[PDB]
């Protein structure tokens, strides 16, 4: 156990080495307190499954760092590679990048991974 959240305040670089440690912690564990206890685990499991599906949708299944073919935009950020990766925490970077939540997501869903799957279908068609 290298510490759950144990690199949060560091560089993106640092955090990227830890991802499994946190990923595993996402998913574990006369009266009706049992309903409360069940309801929580059904919430946790349901949530986890949402995001596994979103990795399926972006074709980032079965990995924890995953590349695509979509370019960046300066409107998303002008700050260079180091001015993120060497310079800040994810706890900051999310609050920076939040504007393109949904945007990048849908842009991936179809125009990346479905388009890869269109191209791959046409490759499978030989």
């Amino acid at each position: 156990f290298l510490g759950f959240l144990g690199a949060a305040g560091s560089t993106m670089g640092a955090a990227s080495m830890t991802l499994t440690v946190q990923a595993r912690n996402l998913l574990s564990g006369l009266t009706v307190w049992g309903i409360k206890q069940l309801q929580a685990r059904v919430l946790a499991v349901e949530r986890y499954l949402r995001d596994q599906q979103l990795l399926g949708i972006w074709g980032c299944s079965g990995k924890l760092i995953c590349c695509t073919n979509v370019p960046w935009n300066s409107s998303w950020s002008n700050r260079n590679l180091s001015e993120i990766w060497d310079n800040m925490t994810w706890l900051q970077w999310d609050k920076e990048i939040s504007n393109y939540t949904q945007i990048i997501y849908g842009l991936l869903e179809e125009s990346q991974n479905q388009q890869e799957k269109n191209e791959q279908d046409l490759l499978a068609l030989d």
Binding site: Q22, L27, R41, A44, L54, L81
Partner: protein, 466 residues
């Protein structure tokens, strides 16, 4: 070089402000002891947790002890446990007859906090009664709607609500509870001395679980709450407003001692079929007023330091302590429970006589001295949660009750604005056990993790065949 490319990092460290239900993590040994247990319950989990804490460093964020919802979560949890933990137990209903009250005549004297009263009940056979008697402390027992004779009396409750005797197993020991969070959430602590209830915390840890909280219920004095950090601290939702509570930890604890020395004898009547019941029978005579004790030395020399800290938010001006604003003894007493027996102790003797806090440094050391004594009433019909919850009946315990506690914090308000010239004066507040919970929970908050984060890198993409 090149443009950057969208890449997916799973499992990114990040969190958001959030709300959730939480585990009731417990001492495991209590589950062996009683069939139900009052806390550490049969409904809670004997996970009996390891105290895992990780100091983060570099990161900082706000804590807010007023807005932290767990105050209310625990308030609901407690009362929710209360009703279910009583619901099967024996009911006063068949006992609600006209009472023939009389003096508590005992061994060349009387039990003057009490009446002796006579009454009847159904036997187990529905078609028979006989006559039976018990003592009671005066507050529960009120004259009949007219005194056609003055001996005509009733229990206080029946014109409003039925009440239940506690099943004797359900012993009111506030056994420590740890709060803990389900997966995808985490708990943050403000491990930061002189954090003052709001704003950023300079230093943060993650924990799976809290320190064990003792859910003691008390009106004016925090009993057995945790030992505060370094020096006395003042917390409020608004320092400036006298109409908002001021909560104060002592730094060092102060001892408090109590007894009903009066040697009460347990007695029973079979109130119909299919129940069993208890009430105060005889007294073995050496009768005293029920009472509690605190050493002046410690108490004064504490109030001194507290006054000095108040002056560091109230410059130069003299600060004093004064009796309760009055009304119901449900507000004016320090009320508390030990061994299951209830107590209602007066504080008007305690909060008095204050020079300027800075000048009280003139005392600050002496040879040791006797206790102040606080005068205590008794009652056995109760309306637990400052008048809410069920009507509840406390059985008398056998004889000698002696019990002890540590004072570690106060509920106060500054009084209404007179001329106030170089002067301010304060009283014990009415309080809420929410604020008794705040007195502990101030240094916690709960958050949810959102483990995705999109980002740039010069990954040379994943083209077909890559």
């Amino acid at each position: 070089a090149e443009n950057l490319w969208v890449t997916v990092y799973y499992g990114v460290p990040v969190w958001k402000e959030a709300k959730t239900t939480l585990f009731c993590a417990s001492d495991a040994r209590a589950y062996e002891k009683e069939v139900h247990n009052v806390w550490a319950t049969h409904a809670c989990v004997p996970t009996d947790p390891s105290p895992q804490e990780l100091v983060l460093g570099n990161v900082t964020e706000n804590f807010n002890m007023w807005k932290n919802d767990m105050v209310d979560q625990m308030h609901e949890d407690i009362i929710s446990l209360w009703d279910q933990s009583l619901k099967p137990c024996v009911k006063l209903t068949p006992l609600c007859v006209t009472l023939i009250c009389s003096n508590a005549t005992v061994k060349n004297g009387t039990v003057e906090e009490m009446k002796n009263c006579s009454f009847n009940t159904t036997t187990e056979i529905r078609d028979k009664e006989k006559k039976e008697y018990a003592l009671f402390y005066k507050p529960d027992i009120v004259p009949l709607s007219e005194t056609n004779n003055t001996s005509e009396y009733r229990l206080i409750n029946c014109n409003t609500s039925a009440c239940t005797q506690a099943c004797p197993k359900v012993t009111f020991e506030p056994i420590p509870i740890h709060y803990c969070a389900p997966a995808g959430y985490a708990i943050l602590k403000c491990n930061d001395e002189t954090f003052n209830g709001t704003g950023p915390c300079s230093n943060v840890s993650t924990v799976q679980c809290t320190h064990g909280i003792r859910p003691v219920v008390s009106t004016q004095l925090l009993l057995n709450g945790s030992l505060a950090e370094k020096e006395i601290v003042i917390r409020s939702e608004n320092l400036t407003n006298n109409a908002k509570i001021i909560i104060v930890h002592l730094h060092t604890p102060v001892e408090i001692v109590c007894t009903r020395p009066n040697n009460n004898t347990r007695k029973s009547v079979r109130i119909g079929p299919g129940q069993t019941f208890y009430a105060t029978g005889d007294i073995i005579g050496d009768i005293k007023q029920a009472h509690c004790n605190i050493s002046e030395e410690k108490w004064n020399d504490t109030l001194q330091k507290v006054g000095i800290e108040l002056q560091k938010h109230f410059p130069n001006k003299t600060i004093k302590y004064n009796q309760s604003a009055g009304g119901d003894m449900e507000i004016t007493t320090h009320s508390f429970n030990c061994g299951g027996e209830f107590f209602y102790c007066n504080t008007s003797n305690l909060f008095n006589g204050t020079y300027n806090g800075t000048y009280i440094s003139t005392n600050s050391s002496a040879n040791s001295t006797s206790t102040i004594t606080l005068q205590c009433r008794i009652k056995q019909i109760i309306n637990m949660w400052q008048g809410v919850g069920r009507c509840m009946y406390a059985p008398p315990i056998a004889g000698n009750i002696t019990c002890r506690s540590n004072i570690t914090g106060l509920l106060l308000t500054r009084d209404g604005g007179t001329n106030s010239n170089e002067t301010e004066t304060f009283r014990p507040a009415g309080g809420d056990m929410r604020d008794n919970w705040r007195s502990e929970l101030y240094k916690y908050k709960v958050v949810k993790i959102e483990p995705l984060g999109v980002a740039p890198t010069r990954c040379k993409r994943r083209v077909v065949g890559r």
